[PDB]
Amino acid sequence: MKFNIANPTTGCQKKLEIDDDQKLRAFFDKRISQEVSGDALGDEFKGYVFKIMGGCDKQGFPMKQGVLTPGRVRLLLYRGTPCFRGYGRRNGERRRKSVRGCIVSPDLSVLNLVIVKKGENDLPGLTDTEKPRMRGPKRASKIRKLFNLSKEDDVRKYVNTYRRNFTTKNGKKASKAPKIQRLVTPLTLQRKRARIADKKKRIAKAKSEAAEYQKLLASRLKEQREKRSE
Amino acid sequence: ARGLKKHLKRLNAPKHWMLDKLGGAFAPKPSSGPHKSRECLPLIIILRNRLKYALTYREVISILMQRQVMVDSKVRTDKTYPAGFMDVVSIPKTNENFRLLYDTKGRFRLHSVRDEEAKFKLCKVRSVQFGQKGIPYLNTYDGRTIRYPDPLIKANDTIKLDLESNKIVDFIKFDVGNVVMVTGGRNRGRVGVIKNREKHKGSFETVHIQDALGHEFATRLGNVFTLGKGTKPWVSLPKGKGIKLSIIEEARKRLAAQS
Amino acid sequence: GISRDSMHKRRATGGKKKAWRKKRKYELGRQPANTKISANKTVRRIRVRGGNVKWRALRLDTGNYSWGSEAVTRKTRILDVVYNASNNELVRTQTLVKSAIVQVDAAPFKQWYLQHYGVDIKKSNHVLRKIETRQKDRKLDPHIEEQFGGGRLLACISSRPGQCGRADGYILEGKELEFYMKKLQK
Amino acid sequence: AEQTEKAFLKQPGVFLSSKKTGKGKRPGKGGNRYFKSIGLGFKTPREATEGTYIDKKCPFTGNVSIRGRILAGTCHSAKMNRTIIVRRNYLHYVKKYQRYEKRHSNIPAHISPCFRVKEGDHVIIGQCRPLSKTVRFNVLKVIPA
RNA sequence: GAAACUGCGAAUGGCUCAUUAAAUCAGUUAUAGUUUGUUUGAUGGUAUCUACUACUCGGAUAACCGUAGUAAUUCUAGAGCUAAUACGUGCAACAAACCCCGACUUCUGGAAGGGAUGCAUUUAUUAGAUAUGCGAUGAUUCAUGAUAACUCGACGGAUCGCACGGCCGCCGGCGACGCAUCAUUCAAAUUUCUGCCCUAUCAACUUUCGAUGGUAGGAUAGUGGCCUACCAUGGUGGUGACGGGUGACGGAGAAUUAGGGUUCGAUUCCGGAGAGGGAGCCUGAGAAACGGCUA
Ligand SMILES: [K+]
Ligand SMILES: [K+]
Ligand SMILES: [K+]
Ligand SMILES: [K+]
Ligand SMILES: [K+]
Ligand SMILES: [K+]
Ligand SMILES: [K+]
Ligand SMILES: [K+]
Ligand SMILES: [K+]
Ligand SMILES: [K+]
Ligand SMILES: [Mg+2]
Ligand SMILES: [Mg+2]
Ligand SMILES: [Mg+2]
Ligand SMILES: [Mg+2]
Ligand SMILES: [Mg+2]
Ligand SMILES: [Mg+2]
Ligand SMILES: [Mg+2]
Ligand SMILES: [Mg+2]
Ligand SMILES: [Mg+2]
Ligand SMILES: [Mg+2]
Ligand SMILES: [Mg+2]
Ligand SMILES: [Mg+2]
Ligand SMILES: [Mg+2]
Ligand SMILES: [Mg+2]
Ligand SMILES: [Mg+2]
Ligand SMILES: [Mg+2]
């Protein structure tokens, strides 16, 4: 069948097809989470350990982790879970769909694999280069952790380090940097101060109202007592 | 139905709104607010149907979204906001202050009031009880809650509320000899002085009211609003002073005016 | 599901009622909790009408029990179920329902009695004076005293474990205690 | 005396095993028997104030309030336990013939142990919350007849 | 500013009259027998207590990008990023008063120290009077207060826009969104009394397996044989029960008019019910929803 090999370290993927049953014998009877040595799968895959991630069958149905069968079953699935995306469907809506079991079998049409251990010889399409991350950290804490900044270092200046510059299709010069989140600014401190002040004013108003009511009751009771004595 | 209704058919709108039969299939459904749906006058009717500042629904929304209309000294941007009895409607741009009062025919009338008279309103007390921590409070029939009320104030009394400070500045006890206006029933909008009160255990109480011309009528306790102490109302009444005129005398006056 | 409507019932005359609408969600019922005594506490959260919350107790071990005469409430352990008025089978299964008669550990109440009255069922002069003053009105029901010997106290569950998730109650006293002891002595 | 059930019957909220005594305490306080006046001009029977029966559905000593419609009728049946059938007799107007026809209504009503009723006497029943499948009324007064 | 996440809505409206004969429904009642997103008015004081970010906590995922499967679907699996008013945590500005234990003590005392103490839940005890203080109703051990405890509490703001100021870094305005409590408004659910066409070639019916009532429980938002266990034999009926028919949804109303009456009411307003027939259910304040799901 076909194979989808992904290298998280380098962010590279490649499609591989095998038609020899002897090589595929290693993957058969394995499960979605188990690891398979790449020695059987070709010769250039020596020293490479592959971790299964999933795959589809000859009808396109995906494999579901936990279904300990090699066949296809029907399950009632929640939206957002694997094998049921449920885009455009209502909240709390479930659907009965067909999924294949987690056990590898010849009925599969493709397998998804992840390189967990690198072998002696690199593969020309996977490990030669690495695709850089497009977006850097956006949270202030993440930026501080990335550059090992202290509590006094200005995280603002380090954002320009990974800002990406480019030329628009018109030929214009443009640059883009992320907006930092969870960054302490004077406005946040002012908002906190205003919250505390509002709490203080509420407490003071309640105390004053209670005192005024007690005074009114005391005055009325004094008047009533004076009336009673006569 | 499976839940709250959001529409109001025009024929089902209260008759005192005076909506055209063929104006449309729907009427503005009053929003939740201090006043009940059947006993309110939405701002859309006031601005479009009554004052004619807006010629359309869209114009009403446009006027209101500029923050130009205030109800009880607070800016309201909701077209279907329920404005009811004794409420003050002010438009600072036009220097207009209105008080919502029932005319002799039982329909809300925008009574122009002075600047001083626009700083307060009257409210009817529903009940007085103890809140959390034992704090006494009372609630009015316009959805208001006031803590630490005067111990003398009790249910069915009228309190003078200062809108600027949101404080009770005076109150009227419900008693015989007080000028009142009827806020419900066939006698809605009439003004007179209470003569006697009939109380029936486990049943509604009947109030007997005498008009300034000696005409007598009776209504339920919940339909009586006290307007002052004695015979002088604390607020200016609309034209007619709550005097219901028979159709014969109305026709006589109309014919006299014609000539 | 379980329905609380009267449509399925007969008329007071005995005649049959013909259906004119389907079941409504606002007249539903849910399965009983059937709470039991077990060291493995398990309380389930139920979302009910209006977004409110109910607590379904499947297994409870301890409860909040109060001594009426002494005006003392302590958290103790429920030992077993001895009597149930509604159904005798509910005693065999150790079901925890309101008004069931249970035996609770007396250790917290014994400790409170020792600390308060200075009696078993260093010290400062002021504490001794306080205890002596409290000793004048120290009157104890003999039946409760005999119960304290075995370490268990008869109690009645006054809460609803299937609704609030707690098996709270009070200790039997006086005529009620005599009544239930007589019913249990058989 | 009244402990004829499998469970102990008592008035809720009436603490009995108190160290103090209910000498000057109001009803329901200090262990004293609880009772109340239902209003509407009705008088609490002397048998409910000094009785020993436990009845949570009793208007004067139970947990049921009287509100709604007060009706009069004749005791049609007194065979149930603390429940009677009250037959109300009235005339229905037949408009076309300008005449009347006799009609009756059977109204199940709870009767407290403080009342002694018999088939044929006049009774006054007040409305309360549903008490059983068909009972919505409580006996408030009996005329022996 | 597309896209996407988040939030809200889609329970309204429109359509139809199949089922349904004290049932729906009309008038008239009740909730002291309950729930109620929202609007309007008021109200938010104890979290770490010996870890010890609060000048601000943590881990993901969409869009995006790139390896795809299937004949195929807002059918679907891996891989690489990155946000929050998403998710999960967490200091929660600081007190007083009340209650319990209480070393120590000039000891009928007061005393260091400790425990408890927000709001909410649950159960007990207690006050809540009224022929020198104490609220409301026709009527409530009602509102509400106090004590003992209890709960492995989705609560008690790690949010956002405008401006730009006064003291000596500290303070500071106008708003938005959001959490909790009460009241109110918008409503529902159940409910009291009276009322419906033809038929006796329908006179007895209901009660194993709830029929009528009682006791104790369970369930419910809440009352109730609504359900369970035990107990009693009850409940309706020529003042027509029960059974059957209806080419029967009920009403506001329509036609005709001496008066009385006769006939009609599917259809635009009100109320109910249904979404090919049943049944079950998630989400949600609200649905037994069907331009939602499951059989
Ligand atoms: K931010
Ligand atoms: K959306
Ligand atoms: K919704
Ligand atoms: K009705
Ligand atoms: K009082
Ligand atoms: K009818
Ligand atoms: K119930
Ligand atoms: K029962
Ligand atoms: K119908
Ligand atoms: K919602
Ligand atoms: Mg609709
Ligand atoms: Mg039909
Ligand atoms: Mg009826
Ligand atoms: Mg509300
Ligand atoms: Mg209370
Ligand atoms: Mg019950
Ligand atoms: Mg019709
Ligand atoms: Mg038809
Ligand atoms: Mg049609
Ligand atoms: Mg309709
Ligand atoms: Mg439906
Ligand atoms: Mg069809
Ligand atoms: Mg279908
Ligand atoms: Mg359906
Ligand atoms: Mg359709
Ligand atoms: Mg629809």
Burial of A110 (0-12, 13-18, 19+ CB in 10 A): middle
Q: Please, what sign has the CA dihedral across residues A193, A194, A195, A201?
A: positive
Residue with tokens 């603390």: D82
Q: Please, what sign has the CA dihedral across residues D123, D126, D129, D134?
A: positive
What resolution (Å)? Answer: 2.4
Distance CA B36, CA D116 (A): 49
Which two structure tokens, joined as six digits, stand for C32? Answer: 């009983």
* Percentages (nearest 5) of helix, strand, coil residues in chain B: 20, 30, 50
Residues linked to residue A3 through DSSP beta bridges, in sequence order: A16, A111
Residue D79 half-sphere exposure, CB side, CA atoms within 13 Å?
2
Which two structure tokens, joined as six digits, stand for C71? Answer: 């005006």
Residues linked to residue B162 through DSSP beta bridges, in sequence order: B120, B167
Cα B140 → chain centroid? 13
- CA dihedral C111→C117→C119→C124, nearest 10 degrees, is 100
- What residues in B contact D41, CB-CB < 8 Å? 201
Distance CA C119, CA C122 (A): 15
Instruction: List Cα–Cα distances, A171 to A162, A166, A167, A168, A176, in angstroms.
Output: 22, 9, 6, 5, 16
Distance CA B183, CA B102 (A): 7
Which residues are in the CB-under-5-Å shell of ion ligand 1? A 181
Distance CA C65, CA B93 (A): 68
CA A179 to C1' E158, whole Å: 18
Interior CA angle at A157 toward A151 and A160, to 5°?
A: 135
Distance CA B232, CA B249 (A): 26
Question: Are chains A and C in touch, 3+ Cβ pairs below 8 Å?
Answer: no
Distance CA C120, CA C113 (A): 7
- For residue D134, the one-letter residue type is T
A54 touches A112 (CB < 8 A): yes
- For residue C55, the one-letter residue type is W
In this structure, what are the phi and psi dihedrals at residue C110, rounded to the nearest 5 degrees? Answer: -60, -45
β A110-117/A2-7 pair status: parallel
Which two structure tokens, joined as six digits, stand for B204? Answer: 């509604």
Q: How far is the centre of ligand 3, averaged over its atoms, from the C-alpha of A91 (Å)?
A: 10
Distance CA D67, CA B201 (A): 11
Distance CA C69, CA D16 (A): 9
Distance CA A144, CA A158 (A): 9
Distance CA C124, CA B208 (A): 75
The secondary element (H helix, E strand) that includes residue C131 is helix C125-135
Interface residue D6 vs chain C (CB under 8 A):
yes
Q: Which residues contact D12 (CB under 8 A, 6 or more apart)?
A: D56, D63
Collapse the DSSP code of B132 into the 3-class scheme (helix H, G, I; strand E, B; otherwise coil) and give the result: helix
Interface residue C9 vs chain D (CB under 8 A):
yes
What is the strand order of the sheet B167-172 is part of? B145-147, B136-140, B120-130, B158-162, B167-172
- For residue A76, the one-letter residue type is L
- Which bases in strand E are touched by protein, i.e. have an atom under 7 Å from a CB? 5, 9-14, 19-24, 29-33, 35-45, 55-59, 63-72, 74-84, 93-94, 101-105, 107-111, 119-130, 132-133, 135-152, 154, 157, 159-164, 169-175, 181-196, 205-207, 210-230, 232-237, 239, 241-243, 260-262, 268-275, 278-290, 292-295
D90 touches D96 (CB < 8 A): no
In this structure, what are the phi and psi dihedrals at residue D91, rounded to the nearest 5 degrees? Answer: -115, 130
Buried b / exposed e over B4-39, threshold 16 CB at 10 Å, is eeeebebeebbebbebeeeeeeebbebeebbbebeb
Instruction: List Cα–Cα distances, A163 to A147, A185, D127, in angstroms.
Output: 15, 22, 79
DSSP string spanning C56-111?
EEEEE-EEEEEETTTTEEEEEEEEEEEE-SS-SHHHHTTB--TT-EEEEE-HHHHH
Reference C155, options C65, C87, C41; nearest CA is: C65
- CA dihedral D133→D139→D140→D145, nearest 10 degrees, is 160
Which two structure tokens, joined as six digits, stand for B134? Answer: 């034992």
Distance CA A146, CA A162 (A): 11
- For residue C75, the one-letter residue type is K
Distance CA B27, CA B30 (A): 9
Interface residue B199 vs chain D (CB under 8 A):
no
Distance CA B118, CA B116 (A): 5
Question: For residue A212, what is the nearest residue in chain B, using CA coordinates?
Answer: B148
Interior CA angle at D144 toward D138 and D145, to 5°?
A: 125
Interface residue B202 vs chain D (CB under 8 A):
yes
Distance CA B58, CA D105 (A): 59
First to last CA, chain C: 42
Collapse the DSSP code of B106 into the 3-class scheme (helix H, G, I; strand E, B; otherwise coil) and give the result: coil
β C2-3/B224-226 pair status: unpaired
Is the CB of C139 less than 8 angstroms away from the CB of D16? Answer: no
- What residues in C contact D133, CB-CB < 8 Å? 6, 9, 12
Q: Which residues contact B66 (CB under 8 A, 6 or more apart)?
A: none
Count of CB atoms situated within 10 Å of the CB of B55:
9
C to D CB pairs, distance under 8 Å: 31
Question: Would you give the DSSP letter of residue A63?
Answer: B
Q: Which residues contact C108 (CB under 8 A, 6 or more apart)?
A: C74, C75, C76
- What residues in B contact A220, CB-CB < 8 Å? 151
- For residue D74, the one-letter residue type is T
CA distance B146 to chain A (A): 12
β D99-110/B82-83 pair status: unpaired
E-strand ranges in B131-205 read: 136-140, 145-147, 158-162, 167-172, 179-182, 191-198
- For residue D128, the one-letter residue type is C
- What residues in D contact B201, CB-CB < 8 Å? 39-41
Residue with tokens 């069968």: A69
Chains that touch B (3 or more CB pairs under 8 A): A, D
The secondary element (H helix, E strand) that includes residue B93 is none
Collapse the DSSP code of C179 into the 3-class scheme (helix H, G, I; strand E, B; otherwise coil) and give the result: helix
CA B227 to C1' E151, whole Å: 53
Reference A54, options A79, A78, A34, A81; nearest CA is: A34
Residue lying closest to nucleotide E142, CA to C1': B129
Nucleotide nearest to C157 (CA to C1'): E123
What is the strand order of the sheet C42-47 is part of? C36-37, C53-60, C42-47
C68 touches C173 (CB < 8 A): yes
* Percentages (nearest 5) of helix, strand, coil residues in chain C: 30, 30, 40
Count of CB atoms situated within 10 Å of the CB of D48:
21
Q: Which residues contact D71 (CB under 8 A, 6 or more apart)?
A: D86, D88, D107, D124, D125, D127, D137
**Contacts by residues B27-34 (CB-CB < 8 Å, ≥ 24 positions apart):** B28/B79, B28/B80, B29/B5, B29/B80, B30/B80, B30/B82, B31/B78, B31/B80, B31/B81, B31/B82, B32/B82, B33/B81, B33/B82, B33/B143, B34/B82, B34/B84, B34/B87, B34/B142, B34/B143, B34/B144
DSSP string spanning A94-125?
EEEEEEE-SS--TTBSEEEEEEEE--SS--TT
HEC assignment per residue over chain D: CCCCCCCCCCCCCCCCCCCCCCCCCCCCCCCCCCCCCCCCCCCCCHHHHCCCCCCCCCCCCCCCCCCCCEEEEEEEECCCCCEEEEEEEEEEEECCCCEEEEEEEEEEEECCCCCCCCCCCEEEEEECCCCCCCCCEEEEEEECC
Which two structure tokens, joined as six digits, stand for D93? Answer: 């107007």
Residue C47 half-sphere exposure, CB side, CA atoms within 13 Å?
1
Burial of C95 (0-12, 13-18, 19+ CB in 10 A): buried
Structure-solving method: cryo-EM
Q: Which of D6, D8, D133 sits opposite C176 (nearest CB)?
A: D8
Q: Please, what sign has the CA dihedral across residues A77, A82, A83, A86?
A: positive
